[PDB]
């Protein structure tokens, strides 16, 4: 990104499928929307899959979410 990493961001429509993983998030809530999870290394781990009422946001690129793997290859510096 211009100024390095960047924040994914991306807030969630309703009914927007959005991804967990297990190994990797610090607490449950910590989610990736679809673009990042797949452009991520934890489509091979143990994820969980959740459909979002709407509104929260993707915590890619959120460097104190995620035990490995915080940000996916595009938002990674
Ligand atoms: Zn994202
Ligand atoms: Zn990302
Ligand atoms: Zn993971």
């Avoid at 993983?21 to 673009?35: E, F, K, Q, S, Y």
């Avoid at 459909?51 to 510096?77: L, M, R």
Wanted: glycine share 12%.
């Amino acid at each position: 990104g211009p100024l390095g990493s960047q924040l994914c961001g991306r807030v969630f429509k309703s009914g927007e499928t959005t991804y967990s993983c297990r190994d990797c998030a610090i607490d449950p809530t910590c989610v990736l929307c679809m673009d990042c999870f797949q452009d991520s290394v934890h489509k091979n781990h143990r994820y969980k899959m959740h459909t979002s009422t709407g509104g929260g946001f993707c915590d890619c690129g959120d460097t104190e979410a995620w035990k490995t793997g915080p940000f996916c290859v595009n938002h990674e510096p």
